[PDB]
Design a protein around this ligand. Structure first.
Ligand SMILES: CCCCCCCCCC(=O)OC[C@H](COP(=O)([O-])OCCN)OC(=O)CCCCCCCCC
Ligand SMILES: CCCCCCCCCC(=O)OC[C@H](COP(=O)([O-])OCCN)OC(=O)CCCCCCCCC
Ligand SMILES: NCCOB(c1ccccc1)c1ccccc1
Ligand SMILES: NCCOB(c1ccccc1)c1ccccc1
Lengths: 619, 619
């Protein structure tokens, strides 16, 4: 187990007048500099420095200075200032202010971070004035974002202060002449201070206000300290800007504010929603499409659809300008979507004809077999190309890509069945039939193109289809357990497990032949198993109905509309790439408009009609 | 019927100037000492005392002094003080202040208790200064905790004052020089004052604040009056400390406060949650495992799992440190749990093989029969050992031990079937089959080891399985009633009750042959019974569905997670004892740490990450 950061009870790890390690740590914690005065003599006598491993705990390397700042008294510790002085006179080649832990848990932890966390501006000023680096990276396992014991604030003192909304500390760390902290400074994972605020943000409104206020103030202060730097353009090692990161992490509240950010006054160039004109309840705004339009790779639209895995994906594609941007794309692509639907209907109309009318008529059948083979190959190549593109995030959103698997599965069976027909084996007919069955089920994918049908479909396939596998797994365990019991008991009907499993399943569809069976010597006991099976399978069905019905209470119809918009969003961003055989170019959305002075942006004109909001401002 | 305590309307039970009993009780109730002045002369004339049975009601022994305190006027009665004086001059060998009732209902009731209940500090001071014992036990049936007419406050004046939050009275009873009341003082059932507050506590928050405030103040005052006494270490006749009693009675609010009690300042040694270090939303506390760890017999963990019967059991195993303590144990024992699961799967894989493949192959069957016999004996001995250990609380938590019954039942049938095979009777095959059926159903017990499967299972078996027996009891009554009717009507199909019961049941599984039957002379009337049975059995099914569906509204998913944690808690505390053939030693949890001065405790380090709570304290 990793050692604790500070412990009044547990002692630190062991692994002129004497000033050994234990008595050194005792005086610094109590905050009495009077007893510390002889430390310089002992250090001079031994020709050693406070940064030496002898004056720290070997498990972490926690120095005496870091010990001192962990027991602040009313926001200050009188022992830390003499401690730095004695270190200065000791001739330390490694200054105590810049000392860091070495443990895998608290790696990079420094005395400056402790002072920032303890909300003591006095210690923060005192350490920085003495040369405490403001770019020390606390890159330990405790500070990394993961399940369980963690506190991610970035890795920098400036980012830690921002995450604790210490407005006084961030002001000093930026404006101090001794050692200013750059806003461009970057942690080990590529996250800046703005990125850190994004990925600590929750969807709760108390913490969303914290992040939005910190994000707004730091962005506005960045315009003063570094006017030539656009802080939102810095990307992590994953290549994500703070806007893109908010999309991937699925944090709507911070995502919405950045996407619709508007500043009035001198800070206008930092805005992303430039209002254009208003007439009554009609508002027109020029939303900025920088890093939002799908024309550029790794955009926000692609990240939400294919890279985000949070349950908040459907609620993000309805925010402006994404709602209107996707609608603008959908109206341009709805003609192609129906053409794709028409081609699949023709392909499966031919599939049905060949499957049924199978042994000029022979020539039509010969052509039908050939067209099916080409159609199956075409679908197989298209689906393989889709999975090749989405190879980095397979099985991450299987609830949405399950139709793309079915199209591939039907394509594989279509091609394989034709191959078996070439081999003239009798087993080609089944595979051709299962291809026909799956494809007619795959026709339900295109219902998303119609609001009239797509909205209704969304309410259904969300949970119910995934629930049935959970009942079947127990039911099949129950089915095989009773089947062997009946077979082992009827051998002195149910001639084999396969027949016994068949008979037991018939009881579920209301066709069981629950009788004495008139033949078996153990007719009563065999009946007991059938009666027990009937009671057990109805307990399981009632167990299923109650659990499934529980989802009805919490359902909201707005979610079904939102999910349908996400389904159209995924389809648009896939068919924008054209086809596998023809990767047509992508049209850039919006128009280039000058919005200020650094300032031209690819703005997208969104018009907003809202009677309720307009009447609220009215007297 | 027990007589009333006080009655303005009903007279008390009958069973110098004259001062008979009736005129004595009249003056004391009215509170006029002027008419009482001659009482000394009458007592002197008769050479009698007020404590004599003549001056009380024979049904209870309620004395005149207890009569006086039952009619206090504005918190005081002017007659009680002269009453004690006249008793003093009467030469009473049994002082009136210490007089108690003799009725089985109000046994031990004294005048001091009445003054405490009536919230009169003036009478409380007046009686105690005259020698009223502060350790009088009111051990009547009225003061014992039971259904109906009762008021349990312990049995002592100090405990009564604590239960009525009379802060002024408890202060006096503890600090009075005349007769201080010991906090160690114990009632008839072993309960001290701290125990009394625990078992009058409700889970409501108005009364929880009452108990917590009284528990905290009395514990803190105990450190001043008796610093050398640890009041929480006193146990009842059942052997339960106040912490253990709160667990058995299932009162979370008082249980949580004691389990996580933290005091800052001089009262630190009374704490049980010693905070260690804090960094942002990360809090680390040293919870005390005294009487909590399962290493010691009759611990809190065992009491909640096996001794508590309240519905609050699942909500207690999620409180810290119990939540982390059980998780620490579970991670150490999850390797053994799967090994136990693997052994049962192998045992039932062999059971299935022998059951099916039954008349080198013969040698394998011979070995399989032998291995099943040893496996059945092993399970039989293990389950008997489990019930021997839990013999004191069988059928108290049958909802949790019902799987342990099924394992025993399957073990008994496994052994008995092999015994019958030795006898070479034909009836061994059925019992071996029912053993196979039950064991495959017993495999559902091990689903609790996986969160992925255990959580889903908990939602189902809570109510639905127990509900079906309630429908079947009426249905079987309906089944036998109609079966005899059809048989008595078809004798001029349904040749016997057994066949008639079989045919009627088929209508429930959607296989009834509801026809005119073409043979019976009373074909129309027999059809009426079948039609009536169909309507009646669907009314019962609709009755069942509506009643069962009503449970969906009030269900909370947090309960299912909590119950699963309790299920793992029971399994851990059972497999900690090793096996019946090898009772391996128990590992003590936590580490011994010095926390103060009486002070070393077996503290358990629990680390708490809570962003929402941390942000609440932030500006
Ligand atoms: C008009 C007559 C058509 C006769 C049948 C020919 C084979 C069609 C096979 C087929 O079903 O293609 C469907 C496809 C769209 O699939 P999707 O985007 O829904 O799939 C994704 C679902 N998630 O549609 C297309 O890609 C367009 C059709 C092919 C155009 C010409 C191809 C030339 C190749 C060199
Ligand atoms: C590995 C090969 C095993 C072949 C079959 C041998 C008989 C096993 C019988 C069996 O099912 O035992 C299950 C048992 C655990 O039961 P539980 O704790 O779930 O039951 C409680 C459920 N509520 O498991 C155990 O206790 C461990 C298995 C026995 C170890 C060696 C025993 C030696 C005896 C001298
Ligand atoms: N082909 C048009 C049918 O669309 B509807 C539809 C049909 C099947 C599944 C989902 C929707 C419909 C919607 C509302 C009322 C009636 C029908
Ligand atoms: N063997 C793993 C199956 O677990 B799951 C499961 C199966 C039966 C009963 C309870 C749980 C499951 C849970 C959620 C979705 C799908 C399946």
């Amino acid at each position: 187990e990793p050692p604790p950061m500070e412990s009044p009870f547990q002692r630190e790890d062991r692994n002129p007048d004497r000033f050994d390690r234990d008595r050194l740590f005792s005086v610094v914690s109590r905050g009495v500099p009077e007893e510390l005065t002889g430390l310089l003599e002992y250090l001079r006598w031994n020709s050693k420095y406070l940064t030496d491993s002898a004056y720290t705990e070997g498990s972490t390397g926690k120095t005496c200075l870091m010990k001192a700042v962990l027991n602040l008294q009313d926001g200050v510790n009188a022992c830390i200032m003499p401690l730095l002085q004695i270190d200065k006179d000791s001739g330390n080649p490694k200054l105590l202010v810049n000392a860091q832990c070495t443990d895998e848990f608290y790696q990079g932890h420094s005395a400056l971070h402790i002072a920032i966390e303890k909300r003591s501006l006095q210690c923060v000023k005192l350490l920085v004035e003495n040369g405490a680096d403001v770019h020390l990276r606390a890159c330990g396992r405790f500070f990394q974002k993961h399940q369980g014991t963690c506190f991610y604030f970035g890795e920098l003192p400036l980012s830690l202060a921002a995450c604790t909304k210490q407005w006084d500390v961030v002001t000093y760390l930026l404006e101090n002449p001794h050692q200013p902290a750059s806003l461009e400074a970057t942690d080990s994972l590529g996250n800046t201070v703005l990125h850190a605020l994004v990925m600590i943000a929750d969807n709760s409104p108390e913490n969303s206000a914290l992040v939005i206020h910190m994000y707004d103030g730091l962005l506005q202060m960045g315009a003063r300290l570094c006017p030539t730097v656009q802080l939102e353009e810095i990307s992590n090692h994953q290549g994500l800007t703070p806007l893109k990161l908010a999309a991937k992490e699925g944090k709507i509240e911070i995502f919405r504010h950045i996407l619709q950010r508007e500043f009035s006054g001198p800070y206008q160039p930092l805005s992303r929603k430039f209002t254009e004109w208003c007439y009554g309840p009609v508002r027109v705004s020029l939303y900025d499409l920088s890093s939002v339009d799908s024309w550029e790779k790794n955009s926000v639209l692609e990240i939400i659809a294919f890279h985000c895995k949070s349950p908040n994906r459907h609620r993000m594609v309805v925010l402006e300008p994404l709602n209107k941007l996707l609608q603008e794309k959908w109206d341009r692509l709805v003609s192609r979507f129906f053409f794709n639907f028409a081609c699949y209907l023709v392909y499966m109309f031919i599939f049905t004809v060949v499957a049924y009318h199978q042994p000029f008529g022979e020539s039509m059948l010969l052509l039908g077999h050939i067209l099916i083979l080409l159609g199956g190959i075409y679908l197989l190549l298209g689906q393989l190309w889709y999975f090749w593109r989405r190879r980095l995030f397979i099985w991450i959103s299987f609830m949405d890509s399950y139709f793309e698997i079915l199209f591939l599965l039907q394509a594989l069976l279509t091609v394989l069945s034709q191959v078996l027909r070439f081999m003239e084996t009798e087993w080609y007919l089944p595979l051709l039939v299962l291809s026909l069955v799956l494809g007619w089920l795959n026709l339900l994918y295109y219902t998303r193109g119609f609001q009239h049908t797509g909205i209704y479909s969304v309410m259904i396939q969300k949970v119910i289809l995934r629930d049935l596998l959970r009942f079947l797994l127990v039911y099949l365990v129950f089915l095989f357990g009773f089947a062997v019991a009946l077979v082992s008991l009827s051998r002195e009907p149910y001639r084999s497990i396969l027949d016994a499993s068949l008979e037991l399943f018939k009881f579920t569809i209301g066709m069981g032949e629950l009788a004495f069976q008139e033949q078996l010597r153990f007719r009563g006991v065999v009946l007991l198993l059938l009666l027990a099976y009937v009671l057990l399978t109805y307990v399981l069905l009632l167990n299923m109905l109650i659990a499934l019905m529980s989802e009805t209470v919490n359902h909201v119809a707005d979610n079904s509309w939102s999910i349908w918009k996400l389904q159209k969003a995924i389809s648009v961003l896939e068919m924008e790439n054209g086809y596998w055989w023809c990767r047509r170019k992508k049209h850039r959305e919006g128009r280039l408009l000058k919005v200020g002075t650094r300032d031209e942006r690819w703005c997208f004109r969104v018009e907003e009609v809202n009677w309720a909001a307009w009447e609220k401002t009215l007297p």
